[PDB]
């Protein structure tokens, strides 16, 4: 497990862009991670997306996954960042199904695929109550701000 | 059972002070309600309470409870307009364990009575079924603007 | 007198949860404190409490008193804080009238007793010397 | 006296740019107003001006003054939902910084209007000491 | 040639999630649009992404493009989308980021119409700063109504 | 040229009051400076100034000019960064606005050293959009310790 403070030792992200509230399982060997992001109406983006109809942005669901991928990529090499960041460089298959709503517990999954040099590929899935909500193959480049 | 949109039809509260994200059960016959508030680090009060140690203000837990009760009240009398149940007191209130980002604050409100338009509710808040806060909420019907 | 920066040396709270704008009197022999919070429509919480009807949340009034209480606690023992007085409970908490934009929320906190790490304060809040809220605040002095 | 709800009926400004918390006196006879803005540490502009040193931006003191003038203007012509656009000032001066916990007193005295160009004599004070003073010039629009 | 007010007539997005500041060219016969988003340090997301190292989130560039696409949509089918109607971002194949967008940059947004089988629309979008390629992707929206 | 980080080494201003997004020209010999501030609808003040009619507060334009002047002041005397010094805005003359700045505009900031009497500086300042005048004033500062 990992609470918000540990999470913040791995991600430089801060308000209003830290989209991982907890990491429930770190399958150290399976090279995969399970974490969630509580979706609440008391978040800053809801008012603008959209007035009268709150729907968590999809791009934000993407960002949530990449952030989880990042944590994983670090724990795998049993290290503690320095600044060091898994820069979101691209993505292939990227899809959404049902929309995420206030009150939902966005579940995040990321599985290690490859890594050619500095590039990393992850297979990420976001789900609400087991029902799939998003899926994409995230691509990151280990960089240093 | 009601989502954020239904919730906002009974509570006049708005961002950044709407602290009930969903109502799982509204037993109008038993005159009680069960709902919750998702605690996320991505909320505006965390940066200030406290930097480097996110802890949901207890006063917000009270606020979340009073809002839970409020929904029940409005429902009990089909009260829509906007006026609310003005939080006027509590004889006893206690906190146990702090609430943290990631928690799902479970809210319980049970209608007790109403004399002179003064409502008393019996509320409890819990996380992972462990008790977090309990208190007797006193609200008094009033029109916003009075 | 204590300006906002001295207050921030004692209270770890920050925007948008620092609810004491100035400490005006500190009576240590009598174990009481007088401070205040300025209410302004230019505060983040007003847009949501409530649209077209700005009223300072009662819970925030409580928060302001608990915060003033803590300053008093540290002051009573010459402490120069990572200690925090956690709000662990309250007895007979009551609100008389609502606090509105333009008001100067006066905060009074008086030491009642202490049993180890559990402190009890007698608190009141007033606008133009009129009662607005009162309660017995219970705090637990703990490491943040 | 005018509370915040009435003020919001004469000014189109809304959070985070409504800088008049209360109108204590509105002298329609003398064509002048007396209002104030409560300065609290819980305002959005303090974190950025400045970290460790909270000082109300002089420009917001100017804006607060212009806004008090605007309430006078609208009262005078009984204007409901236009705007009193800030077009200038000739001599503007700041004497001391305004800090958290200060009650920013705002004074506006109507001077004249010609071709829809309004001119007001403004002053701001804290604990009755002078903080700012300037001649605000506005022009109706929208 | 649309300003911010006209834009808010087509997109239901509002603060802090409206990322199209101006439409410089709307070529309907060419089924393509050109708009931009002024990037300023004075925006809510920079403090969190990242402290002392401001970099516009890539995901927000994707969002900016999906918004420009939506504006092109409505204009194409000559409608006045005054009814919460929206182009719900459903997916995207091949998405790339070629360099960080920083404050002061003027995010140039380009969206080219492609297909439209049933209610699912497809757009070929590119983002550039100082004419240099920044991002590129294939946005797939699914017209629905909130 | 100066990017946002360099700018933040000279100016202590932070969100939401940093109004210089980039410095394009620093002419020491001529004692002038050219910088700009990107105006985006995605900024905290627009919602309040005004709802449905976004206009950049003229006073913020003043602030933006004073901030650019400060940078000029330091560069002129080769003053190394974070000095803990602030060019405190203490007064002005001939302040005039000729037209509103709107979302999408790139506010151009010009500041020209006029004279210095010990700690009191005077600058000749102008702001423009698309090279057309928007604001002008003589900015008087007092170099003091933050």
Curated annotation (Swiss-Prot), chain B:
Its main location: cytoplasm. SUPFAM superfamilies: Thioesterase/thiol ester dehydrase-isomerase (SSF54637). The keyword Phosphoprotein does not apply. It catalyses: a (3R)-hydroxyacyl-[ACP] = a (2E)-enoyl-[ACP] + H2O. It comes from the Bacteria. Keywords: Cytoplasm, Lipid A biosynthesis, Lipid biosynthesis, Lipid metabolism, Lyase. The keyword Oxidoreductase does not apply. It is found in: Cytoplasm. The active site is at 49. Pfam families: FabA. One of its GO terms (molecular function) is (3R)-hydroxyacyl-[acyl-carrier-protein] dehydratase activity. Its EC number is 4.2.1.59. One of its GO terms (biological process) is lipid A biosynthetic process. One of its GO terms (cellular component) is cytoplasm. InterPro entries: FabA_FabZ, FabZ, HotDog_dom_sf. Involved in unsaturated fatty acids biosynthesis. Catalyzes the dehydration of short chain beta-hydroxyacyl-ACPs and long chain saturated and unsaturated beta-hydroxyacyl-ACPs. PANTHER family: 3-HYDROXYACYL-[ACYL-CARRIER-PROTEIN] DEHYDRATASE. Belongs to the thioester dehydratase family. FabZ subfamily. This is 3-hydroxyacyl-[acyl-carrier-protein] dehydratase FabZ. The lineage of its organism: Bacteria, Pseudomonadati, Pseudomonadota, Gammaproteobacteria, Pseudomonadales.
């Amino acid at each position: 497990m990992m609470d918000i403070n540990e999470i913040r030792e791995y991600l430089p992200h801060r308000y209003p862009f830290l989209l991982v509230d907890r990491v429930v399982e770190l399958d150290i060997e399976g090279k995969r991670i399970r974490a969630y992001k509580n979706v609440s109406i008391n978040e800053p983006f809801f008012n603008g997306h959209f007035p009268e109809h709150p729907i968590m942005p999809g791009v934000l669901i993407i960002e949530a996954m990449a952030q989880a991928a990042g944590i994983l990529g670090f724990k795998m090499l049993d290290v503690k960042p320095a600044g060091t960041l898994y820069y979101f460089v691209g993505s292939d298959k990227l899809r959404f199904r049902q929309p995420v709503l206030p009150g939902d517990q966005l579940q995040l999954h990321a599985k290690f695929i490859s890594v050619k040099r500095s590039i990393w590929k992850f297979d990420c899935h976001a789900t609400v109550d087991d029902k799939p909500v998003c899926s994409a193959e995230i691509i990151c480049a280990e960089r240093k701000l």
